[PDB]
Amino acid sequence: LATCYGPVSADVMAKAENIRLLILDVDGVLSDGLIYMGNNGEELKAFNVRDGYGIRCALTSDIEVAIITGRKAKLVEDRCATLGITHLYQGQSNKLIAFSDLLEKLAIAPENVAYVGDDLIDWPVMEKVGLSVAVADAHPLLIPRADYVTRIAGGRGAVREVCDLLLLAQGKLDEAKGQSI
Amino acid sequence: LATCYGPVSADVMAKAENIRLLILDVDGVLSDGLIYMGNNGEELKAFNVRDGYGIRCALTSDIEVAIITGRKAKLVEDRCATLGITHLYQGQSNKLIAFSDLLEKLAIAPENVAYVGDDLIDWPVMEKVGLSVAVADAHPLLIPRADYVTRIAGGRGAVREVCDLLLLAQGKLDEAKGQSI
Amino acid sequence: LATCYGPVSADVMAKAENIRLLILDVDGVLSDGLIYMGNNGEELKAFNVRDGYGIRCALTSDIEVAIITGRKAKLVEDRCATLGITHLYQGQSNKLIAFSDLLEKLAIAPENVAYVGDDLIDWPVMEKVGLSVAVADAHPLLIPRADYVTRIAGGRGAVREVCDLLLLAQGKLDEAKG
Amino acid sequence: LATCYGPVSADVMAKAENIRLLILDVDGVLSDGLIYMGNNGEELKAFNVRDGYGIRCALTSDIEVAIITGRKAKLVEDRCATLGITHLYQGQSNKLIAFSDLLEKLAIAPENVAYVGDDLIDWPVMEKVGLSVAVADAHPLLIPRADYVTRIAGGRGAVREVCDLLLLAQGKLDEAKGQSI
Amino acid sequence: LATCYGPVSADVMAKAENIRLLILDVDGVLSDGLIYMGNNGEELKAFNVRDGYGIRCALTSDIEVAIITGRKAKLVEDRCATLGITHLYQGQSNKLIAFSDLLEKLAIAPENVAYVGDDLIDWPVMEKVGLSVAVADAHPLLIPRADYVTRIAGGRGAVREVCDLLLLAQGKLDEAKGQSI
Amino acid sequence: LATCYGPVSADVMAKAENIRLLILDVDGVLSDGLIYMGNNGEELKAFNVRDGYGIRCALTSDIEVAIITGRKAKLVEDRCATLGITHLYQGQSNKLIAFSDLLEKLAIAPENVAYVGDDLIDWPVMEKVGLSVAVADAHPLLIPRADYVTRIAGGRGAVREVCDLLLLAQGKLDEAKGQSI
Amino acid sequence: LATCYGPVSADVMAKAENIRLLILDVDGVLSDGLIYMGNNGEELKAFNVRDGYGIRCALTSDIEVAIITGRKAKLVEDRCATLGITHLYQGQSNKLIAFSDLLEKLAIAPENVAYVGDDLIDWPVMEKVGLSVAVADAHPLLIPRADYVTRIAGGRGAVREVCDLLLLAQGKLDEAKGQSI
Amino acid sequence: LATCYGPVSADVMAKAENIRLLILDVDGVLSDGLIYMGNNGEELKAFNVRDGYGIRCALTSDIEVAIITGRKAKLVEDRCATLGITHLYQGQSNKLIAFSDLLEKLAIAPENVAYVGDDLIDWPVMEKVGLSVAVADAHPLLIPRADYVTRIAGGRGAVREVCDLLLLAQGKLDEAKGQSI
Ligand SMILES: [Ca+2]
Ligand SMILES: [Ca+2]
Ligand SMILES: [Ca+2]
Ligand SMILES: [Ca+2]
Ligand SMILES: [Ca+2]
Ligand SMILES: [Ca+2]
Ligand SMILES: [Ca+2]
Ligand SMILES: [Ca+2]
């Protein structure tokens, strides 16, 4: 099965077909893994607009989007607001707790869940989900564990790539509309 | 014929000869597709100074330069001011509305218009223009659709490349002068 | 739409749908452009096995395969014979002559012909065909002229890529065998 | 776990551990996919010496090496004789005849069988084996189907790579000895 | 000996086993060598979260992490505060003074120390330590002097690479746990 | 002769031997050509620390460093202050004026001057100096005009590279000591 | 000026404009620098067909082509015969001897001569000619010495590139025609 | 000190200054690792002529060049003949035997010997010599063990690089005169 990023297995496509919830890591997935820090305590993070468009397409194609992140920042709240992401868990080490809460609130089986991570701290959740995704430049020890490895790096369109994959699998890609913000 | 970025087709050269208006996307085209967000509500974007030089050369050589963007930020208005861009459309989901508004105000035919984009939301406009351009690292589904694909990535000199192309085709490249800002 | 080598335009896919004959340049297209010459007058040329599979797929799926070369070698006859190619023109400077001979013999319109080339001498023929193809590492001046530029280089699987494209466009890719 | 070619999944390492027979494709796997032909009818094929060493290590460390190829030439016979490969099947469209012959002769289950191929014609065999492998530069559609994809290209050491993996997983790589021929 | 970044020498793995103190450069090691400066006198630097996870792993595994910088910035104090780095030295031109100071305070022999640098100013200290490390994109002249050259660039996970190496050498990597901060 | 960035011509080394003044462009030479802008008028630019070390080595080794830039920002003054650069020209559209002034004030012949540029507006000055330099990623049309093309891209160490070259040509490289700032 | 291989300097184009004779190295220039030797005393060498087309264009556009090679083989004579090269010197250790003979025979000044080489043994002749050319993958010490360094590697179209440059400079490229042999 | 392939360590250079004997592997060192086999029992192996020039330079500069290879072919004898190599051992599985014979015959201490290899079978010999060299594309497990790793791949100029290194260290590089064969 061909995609606009390269061929994927029938098994990966079958997994993506069932996804009702896409959970995303922030650092190294939605960003390039950097943290910008200033002398007056300012903190910045870079997000990618094409990911934003992808998220918008998913959110309006009956695919819920969630975020579970180890750090905690107001800027992430602002980013979730502008994209319309209502499910946000910040400052969590053991991400299994947020994951159990998500499966509870949305009444959703783990087989209908996809997760995109970039480090070993993400694997406990990724192990349980229907479609585990590692970004192109994730930690070397995570890459072979995931169901699908993206072609695009974290913060460069890896999330858009996953969004495109889910929509294509469900026959929603051609008629998908979002906002490139 | 020969350009400093590599050979281009005669058809692309001929399209570029009639361009009286260059419409530019912002995110992914004039920038590398990143939005910097802070904890105090700050927002940054990165612009390329060699693109600035190209835009100046275009404006000072009878080629109007316009911007249509899906995002809305004051920093964009500032950047347009410093470059002497007077045509700015922000927060536009359906870019056809703004595109139609531009052509009626400037009294210019769609064939005399070039558009440089990076995502699928730009295509409805790009389809109608004389010279459609996708940046090197545009969305993979956009690339095969455009009349021309730049060698240089978004935010790295892709706009300059397009400006160089228009000027050369119009025999203005030798005499064109600008400010590297 | 989507291909295993990456996205292609609607216009290119429409062109590939109509192809009944694929004409192939040899040097730089079926080979990496190299000529091996020996002291006893030996001559070798390298061919790609995956191109072979693609040509066998096309030939058994209603797509005829032809060759027009500027060089002349017995080894090229041997290669065609093993692949079941019957239309071979060697030592052809002006490739337009061999081209007209093919359209006549097979009773085929130039719109239903694809040509894969790598140098400027191939252009007079590529201009006339429905689907012109330059290989990834073709001469720089030929590349922007073609309808489609391959992702794979000459002798590396560029021909297989084109066979894949024709069979995909014709809905034959799944069923085809080589 | 970690290999000298990069991390592999526990799944691949566990599959490699269980392997008693290694079936190898020739063209595009043991060679770089090229057929060198001459005017007098001479034919050449190129092989990699570091692959040779790996085959000698596998054969000396209780792993069988077998070849199923669609082509037929005397040179392939000669290569196998220099390596001590006793199981060779040439000129076959359907590689399932040879694969099943190899299972009855060695009394070996499909799971203890690993296959290295580079094209779609190999897939029927690889589908049924314990560890299916595709070389780095295999046909794009074959790549996502394999359990393992080699880092090294066909004819460059993709076979050595698989031999190194088979030996590592079996704890034989430390004291494995071969001849670089 | 196999790591997830590729093979390392037995001597490097032996040196890495004895490490109780890891001293790190900031600029070009924890960052990509860039200083972001503003008109109101702002200063930003970028850090890598996967480096943070590595640092947290070392500190919780009996490996002290310290920093010696030639620059002085409040932002760096903040980054150290998040990671649990208690030994910070800023504004220091001659890094030997800070180096001698650390060994005296921690009662540690130089052979039990590792240093990760990127420029020639780091060498006088690196020469003395048990394990000297130059990052992948360090100054050309520093690279051949170091015991180990990282595969990953400064600011992109070179520090995490060293942490992973130290933990594997000491048999602590499997059980090592940190926070991606 | 051999340098740590690769071989250089005998003419380039002879030209570097005579250099008493190094003139640098800012944008695309000391930076990667990006301008960061915010919604509150904030302006940011990124500088490279290893460039800073080079400039420090040059200034302390009897090579004067000057800057001529077409933009104007306070942050550039802050950078020049820290590096000890006293010759700065901002908002300079025609760079030939600042060049004439520098030769006048410092009593220096153009043959003893080096200029590092990245765009075509730099050329009128570069044409007159003893050693003209284009950065690796300078505008395509400037590259073939320059006496030397750096290996390193602008804002990534292109200036450190030129600094190393001048110091090597003059036999000051080993004696050179600066601050990594 | 712009070429299909990228920009070249005005000085390079001026040198190319005067060229009446192009002299070529064989090994590393017309070939990829390989010698194929066999057990029966067979010797092979690889030539590039697009180089042959370029050579045919040169000879038919009032540009004499000649070869000076340090080795001697009958295959080279055969190659020259197919291309119509009539000036061939083999087994040539001091290439200045053949160079003088050629210039005497054709009554041509050193300035009207171009030489394409790949190794240091070629420099004494290259130093004297109007246009000296080192191929992209020439010996690293030769590269900085040449007037022009080709973009394309030896045996891959470096000679075609030089032919293309001479024809363009002399205004003969559009109407130049050869045979792809 | 600095070389035309990049900086080497002061240790590697000091080792290179003592080298009187250069022992070379064949397959993967003087060639790219390929064995060409034919239907009528023909064998070919490709040699690099720039390597030949380097070997000629070594042999004329008080550096003996020897060969120990695991395979056995008349073509290798022919290649040694043309280069003037008289010390050739073929079909050697345990290379320590021929190594002991060499040191015995030439009356040379192992510290004054250099070995260039590409696989693990070379290591027992490399472990004993003064300068062990692994080629750029050697087996991954060999690379970290060698004193020096070449920039150039086997059969592409790796041997030339080593020759250039020995001559440079002994002050004979500009001196060096050979035949490009
Ligand atoms: Ca993460
Ligand atoms: Ca956009
Ligand atoms: Ca051709
Ligand atoms: Ca195969
Ligand atoms: Ca530093
Ligand atoms: Ca600039
Ligand atoms: Ca040569
Ligand atoms: Ca070997």
UniProtKB/Swiss-Prot annotation, chains A, B, D, E, F, G, H:
One Gene Ontology biological process: lipopolysaccharide biosynthetic process
Sites where the protein binds Mg(2+): 25, 27, 118
Cofactor field: Mg(2+)
Keyword list, A-Z: Hydrolase, Lipopolysaccharide biosynthesis, Magnesium, Metal-binding
A single MF term (Gene Ontology): 3-deoxy-manno-octulosonate-8-phosphatase activity
Annotated residues for binding of substrate: 27, 48-52, 56, 71, 79, 95
Domain of life of the native organism: Bacteria
One Pfam family per UniProt: Hydrolase_3
Subunit structure: Homotetramer.
The name this protein goes by in its record: 3-deoxy-D-manno-octulosonate 8-phosphate phosphatase KdsC
Gene that encodes it: kdsC
Curated annotation (Swiss-Prot), chain C:
One record GO biological process: lipopolysaccharide biosynthetic process
EC number: 3.1.3.45
CDD domains reported for this sequence: HAD_KDO-like (cd01630)
Enzyme kind, highest EC tier: hydrolase
Binding site for substrate: 27, 48-52, 56, 71, 79, 95
Keywords of this entry: Hydrolase, Lipopolysaccharide biosynthesis, Magnesium, Metal-binding
Keyword ATP-binding applies: no
Functional pathway: Carbohydrate biosynthesis; 3-deoxy-D-manno-octulosonate biosynthesis; 3-deoxy-D-manno-octulosonate from D-ribulose 5-phosphate: step 3/3; Bacterial outer membrane biogenesis; lipopolysaccharide biosynthesis
One Pfam family here: Hydrolase_3
Binding site for Mg(2+): 25, 27, 118
InterPro entries the UniProt entry points to: CMP-NeuNAc_synthase, HAD-like_sf, HAD_sf, KdsC_fam
Catalytic activity: 3-deoxy-alpha-D-manno-2-octulosonate-8-phosphate + H2O = 3-deoxy-alpha-D-manno-oct-2-ulosonate + phosphate
Named cofactor requirement(s): Mg(2+)
Record flagged with keyword Metal-binding: yes
MF term (GO), any: metal ion binding
NCBIfam families associated with the record: KdsC-phosphatas, PRK09484.1
Protein family: Belongs to the KdsC family.
Subunit structure: Homotetramer.
Physiological role: Catalyzes the hydrolysis of 3-deoxy-D-manno-octulosonate 8-phosphate (KDO 8-P) to 3-deoxy-D-manno-octulosonate (KDO) and inorganic phosphate.
Protein's name according to its UniProt entry: 3-deoxy-D-manno-octulosonate 8-phosphate phosphatase KdsC
